[PDB]
Design a protein around this ligand. Structure first.
Ligand SMILES: C=CC[C@@H]1/C=C(\C)C[C@H](C)C[C@H](OC)[C@H]2O[C@@](O)(C(=O)C(=O)N3CCCC[C@H]3C(=O)O[C@H](/C(C)=C/[C@@H]3CC[C@@H](O)[C@H](OC)C3)[C@H](C)[C@@H](O)CC1=O)[C@H](C)C[C@@H]2OC
Ligand SMILES: C=CC[C@@H]1/C=C(\C)C[C@H](C)C[C@H](OC)[C@H]2O[C@@](O)(C(=O)C(=O)N3CCCC[C@H]3C(=O)O[C@H](/C(C)=C/[C@@H]3CC[C@@H](O)[C@H](OC)C3)[C@H](C)[C@@H](O)CC1=O)[C@H](C)C[C@@H]2OC
Lengths: 210, 210
């Protein structure tokens, strides 16, 4: 294929800009914003060959207005998701908390011990070894150590408060379901894969405490 | 001929990215690196269609090596420039030093007293106030105090050695032309606006010694 570097590196540098444009389009689609892909490419080709059909001022201004649109659309969507997820989350916890075997701690953490396990109570400075499954209240799975490949280890005080607190309710060999409010998890900001004010549901198997 | 925002903003976004690429390639060009632009647009299109001939891993691998080639070529070019200026500067100094009224000091500073001035000469702990104009040997002006509408003040011992020494050759009210070898100036590394091993030409007026 590639005869050498002025070729290989060029293609890579280009592939990388492609990649980047696809990723970018992917975030705009979250907001219902769909740019014309043929035009996006034509602009790239035109510029790369110095034949842009828009002046530098028209480019500056068009981008300026477009990025105001994106930010203004993303902000509104964050705001609405935050409020929606806070209320749906609350309702969800309230319903689940009333069920048999389910408990609510003084912090608002809602949990269901499935297997107590046996051994020492995990403490903040312990390293726990776990398998887990993490999903949003709507059933969307966001994390799964099982399909990731191996049991994960961490310091108990290095994880979110919902976990630091929850795992203390069981021992090695145990299993618990944690239903965690955003204020004991990722809050209003959320993190990639976790929307604002998200209540999280984890099914955790505690393999070791060391 | 854009009909709508999804069309115009997309073109704009593309043109802006492609212009960014072209600007980086232009810098690569100053170093003798001229990427194959047909392959570059091939990568853009292929990755855009999710058919990059390079995997994400290969892309990253290719660009790391490419990045190493650029830096290495950047260094080679500073080295060639260092050698070229050193030589060109030595010739320029040699020719000028033979002219009527020009002197060469023991350190290799070449200078021409235009007006002796009158009063004390600058000594090491002293402060001097000067107007000056600095140019590279080809005539490009890198600094001109006259344009700030005010002279410059500094400690004689706080400046490059060619000035520290050179100004001891005149007195308050004097003028002198200093032709300074790189080793009494910014040396092989230079500074922004002053290339490697540049010989500097300064026209100085000494206003005060205090
Ligand atoms: C940047 C370094 C990467 C580094 C990545 C790893 C070692 C891999 C590790 C298996 C994480 C998973 O990666 C595949 C993935 O697991 C999640 O999907 C998840 O199920 C989860 O919620 N878990 C994992 C299990 C314990 C509860 C919790 C957590 O406490 O996770 C912790 C977490 C993110 C705490 C933040 C820390 C920042 C604070 O500001 C914030 O405070 C609000 C809380 C994890 C252990 C971090 O400490 C360590 C890291 O982040 C997150 C949704 C995102 C996370 O990927 C990043
Ligand atoms: C708050 C005060 C900070 C103050 C910062 C500024 C005003 C910088 C500002 C942009 C304009 C500078 O000039 C006003 C400008 O001056 C040049 O254009 C120039 O014509 C020059 O070569 N000059 C100026 C006149 C005397 C000769 C000489 C010099 O010796 O300059 C001196 C110098 C740089 C000494 C270094 C000291 C460290 C040594 O290690 C090095 O030795 C290698 C030499 C100057 C006087 C410093 O004392 C002044 C300062 O520090 C340089 C090409 C680049 C330099 O800007 C970067």
């Amino acid at each position: 294929a590639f005869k050498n570097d002025d070729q290989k590196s060029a293609y890579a540098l280009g592939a990388s800009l492609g990649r980047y444009m696809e990723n970018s389009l992917k975030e705009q689609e979250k907001l219902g914003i769909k740019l014309d892909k043929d035009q996006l490419i034509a602009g790239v080709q035109d510029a790369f060959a110095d034949k842009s059909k828009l002046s530098d001022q028209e480019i500056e201004q068009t981008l300026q207005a477009f990025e105001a649109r994106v930010k203004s659309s993303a902000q509104a969507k964050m705001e609405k998701d935050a409020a929606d997820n806070e209320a749906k989350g609350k309702e969800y916890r309230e319903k689940f908390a009333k069920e048999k075997g389910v408990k609510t701690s003084s912090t608002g953490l809602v949990y269901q011990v499935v297997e107590a396990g046996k051994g020492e109570a995990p403490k903040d400075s312990d390293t726990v070894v776990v398998n887990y499954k993490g999903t949003l209240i709507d059933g969307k799975e966001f994390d799964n150590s099982y399909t990731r490949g191996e049991p994960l280890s961490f310091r108990l005080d290095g994880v979110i408060p919902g976990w630091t607190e929850g795992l203390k309710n069981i021992k090695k060999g145990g299993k618990i379901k944690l239903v965690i409010p955003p204020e004991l998890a990722y809050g209003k900001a959320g993190v990639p894969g976790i929307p604002p004010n998200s209540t999280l549901v984890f099914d955790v198997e505690l393999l070791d405490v060391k």
